[PDB]
Design an enzyme around this catalytic site. Structure first.
Site, PDB file in Angstrom:
ATOM      1  N   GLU A 179       0.812  -1.197   0.000  1.00 28.52           N
ATOM      2  CA  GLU A 179       0.000   0.000   0.000  1.00 28.52           C
ATOM      3  C   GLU A 179       0.860   1.268   0.000  1.00 28.52           C
ATOM      4  O   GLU A 179       2.028   1.260   0.337  1.00 28.52           O
ATOM      5  CB  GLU A 179      -0.953  -0.018   1.212  1.00 28.52           C
ATOM      6  CG  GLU A 179      -0.303  -0.532   2.486  1.00 28.52           C
ATOM      7  CD  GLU A 179       0.876   0.301   2.957  1.00 28.52           C
ATOM      8  OE1 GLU A 179       0.749   1.545   3.140  1.00 28.52           O
ATOM      9  OE2 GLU A 179       1.977  -0.273   3.157  1.00 28.52           O
ATOM     10  N   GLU A 218       4.585  -0.661   1.744  1.00 29.21           N
ATOM     11  CA  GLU A 218       4.648  -0.638   0.268  1.00 29.21           C
ATOM     12  C   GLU A 218       4.699  -1.979  -0.383  1.00 29.21           C
ATOM     13  O   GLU A 218       4.792  -2.022  -1.589  1.00 29.21           O
ATOM     14  CB  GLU A 218       5.901   0.069  -0.316  1.00 29.21           C
ATOM     15  CG  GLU A 218       6.258   1.393   0.258  1.00 29.21           C
ATOM     16  CD  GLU A 218       7.492   2.037  -0.387  1.00 29.21           C
ATOM     17  OE1 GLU A 218       8.183   1.506  -1.309  1.00 29.21           O
ATOM     18  OE2 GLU A 218       7.752   3.114   0.082  1.00 29.21           O
TER      19      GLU A 218
HETATM   20  C1  LIG Z   1       8.690   9.794   2.348  1.00 25.25           C
HETATM   21  C2  LIG Z   1       7.804   8.600   2.582  1.00 25.25           C
HETATM   22  C3  LIG Z   1       6.770   8.672   3.508  1.00 25.25           C
HETATM   23  C4  LIG Z   1       5.952   7.569   3.723  1.00 25.25           C
HETATM   24  C5  LIG Z   1       6.167   6.394   3.011  1.00 25.25           C
HETATM   25  O1  LIG Z   1       5.365   5.314   3.221  1.00 25.25           O
HETATM   26  C6  LIG Z   1       7.201   6.324   2.084  1.00 25.25           C
HETATM   27  C7  LIG Z   1       8.019   7.426   1.869  1.00 25.25           C
END
Ligand SMILES: Cc1ccc(O)cc1
Ligand SMILES: Cc1ccc(O)cc1
EC number: 2.4.2.21
Lengths: 347, 344
Positions: B172, B315
């Protein structure tokens, strides 16, 4: 030259490590959010054999094969000849470590440091003898034999480095070798043999009492000195365990990382770090093996493995399994974008 | 059609799993000695999309991106626009998940399920709205919206099997989304918010009490029913969480494995397993994330991750990191050699 090897293990590059921290903090993520991948990358950045940065070129798993006199005490369920059969299978690519090394893009070097069989074609001969001495009744080998094999294996290891290997893994093959491994762990950590003796290669639980007794007997007849790791290796180790310690010393002298495997490798790492504390920054754990004495050995090395697989095969299989983790830390460091390029800045 | 999809998730194949176990026990090793790699190979062998055997073909990490109304309550430390910035960076291959997916030989599919920005060219458009409702004051979305997005994502996911994908990962991107994730975990597990609300993306510890308050508010206001996972998602979830649940439902419908990631994904997995218990045999943990609620959520899933990396990026990064473990199980099974030799 052994004195010289030990003396000349380089300190890690603390300045490269500090630059690595600063770089990782600027990558496209919340600071700290990649956890131990970040600390692994910084650890790699400090290894002088790499390029100031996490780097992975060629990969090699060095598998140290030998037989043990103490098999005669009934501490192993498999026939003696399985060591030799398995070394030969290593040359055919059919073992657990071979298959996992292949998947990781690593080469397996099968090294005979003392199998009690005829020589096996395809295997590197560093054969000290046809099995080591039975540790329950006397020493595994002479001090000179242990020092000579440490030097030979360290040199073989650092020659690979000159050939472009940047990441090592260590493994072993040797029926009954969990017996001397447990004896060394008991001696180095001060733990009673009972706390660190496990089933090895499926020893029936009814036979564990005899194995604990054998370990105690080995320790008593030899009087290994915990303050002298070479004394311990020579007395209640074996050729495989010496060879493993040699790969760690070689890789450290070369300023390069080595992945541990399971319990046999933890015991060799306890020896290597007693011999030369400078080895320690070069060691990387792979997995937390499912061997009784694993927790105690790892606690004494201040190590927390990355992988929890309940694995207990040995051979270097866990080291091979963890190679992609080291590559992932490198990929993060070199391929991630940066916060500043997206103008992401917080107060 | 969502009902039909759920009903038609296949059971794992016991016969294939028994054949796999017998094969593994005859490999060139002491029985049991490869531990959870053995158990994983058997779990894979049972998944009907894999055609009887652990195998891995193509790999895909599906990253579900959306914004959250609850950002307005002060629960996130990054500006809301970071969601859209990061989704675009995903198309450029510069994010953590991209770099780890590439290392694993996997493709990242970036899917916009409701970013509060204009559509990003090159991102898959499944956008429900420009951000979800603020869960502190009412529902994230309607039940119809949640059901429609579950079906759309499930269909997309199983359609990837046609392009040869056999192994999924879920991820996500969504500023503030650890707030609905904690609310759902609280609802499904019965744990108080304090036990499951963490720092997220480095929220200052002095702002944690407020986040806990918001989570409790969201639950109080919406009264999600823990026995109705779609109700929970629609009320105190978000579009990203719904999307993640949808990937799991689609992988399970296809008879194929999906690797979880961290806390967001555990929250979506709890929803998926409540909606359709038949999803569970298809889920594979990756890592034990360094998020406060992780242990509780994993306990409720009866899951023990393979990797202990203190990771908390999200992610899909952890799912990608674990893909080589799945490949290792397949390599063991297909490439190892085979063995009354034991001593009395
Ligand atoms: C900069 C950042 C912030 C949140 C994130 O999930 C990823 C990158
Ligand atoms: C058959 C066998 C026994 C022990 C071992 O380590 C490997 C294979």
């Amino acid at each position: 030259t052994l004195h010289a090897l030990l003396r000349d293990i380089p300190a890690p590059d603390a300045e490269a490590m500090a630059r690595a921290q600063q770089h990782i903090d600027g990558l496209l993520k919340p600071p700290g959010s990649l956890g131990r991948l970040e600390t692994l990358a910084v650890q790699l950045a400090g290894m002088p054999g790499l390029n100031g940065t996490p780097q992975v070129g060629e990969k090699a798993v060095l598998v140290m094969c030998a037989d043990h006199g103490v098999w005669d005490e009934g501490v192993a369920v498999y026939p003696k000849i399985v060591t030799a059969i398995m070394a030969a299978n290593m040359t055919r690519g059919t073992t657990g470590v071979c298959v996992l090394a292949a998947q990781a893009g690593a080469k397996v070097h099968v090294i005979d440091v003392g199998i009690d069989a005829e020589p096996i074609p395809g295997v590197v001969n560093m054969r000290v003898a046809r099995g080591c001495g039975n540790i329950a009744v006397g020493p595994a080998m002479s001090r000179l034999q242990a020092e000579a094999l440490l030097l030979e294996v360290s040199r073989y290891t650092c020659d690979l480095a000159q050939r472009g290997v940047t990441l090592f893994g260590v493994g072993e093959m040797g029926m009954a070798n969990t017996t001397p491994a447990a004896a060394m762990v008991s001696v180095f950590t001060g733990s009673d043999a009972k706390e660190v003796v496990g089933i090895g290669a499926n020893l029936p639980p009814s036979r564990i009492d005899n194995k604990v007794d054998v370990v105690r007997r080995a320790i008593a007849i030899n009087q290994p000195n915990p303050r002298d790791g070479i004394d311990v290796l020579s007395k209640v180790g074996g050729f495989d365990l010496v060879g493993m310690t040699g790969v760690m010393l070689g890789a450290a002298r070369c300023g390069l990382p080595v992945l541990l495997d399971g319990f046999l490798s933890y015991s060799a790492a306890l020896a290597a770090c007693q011999i030369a504390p400078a080895v320690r920054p070069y060691l990387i754990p792979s997995h937390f093996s499912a061997e009784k004495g694993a927790r105690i050995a790892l606690a004494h090395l201040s190590m927390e493995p990355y992988l929890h697989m309940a694995m207990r095969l040995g051979e270097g299989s866990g080291a091979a399994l963890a190679m992609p983790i080291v590559e992932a830390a490198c990929a993060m460091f070199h391929n991630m974008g940066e916060l500043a390029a997206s103008n992401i800045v917080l107060p």
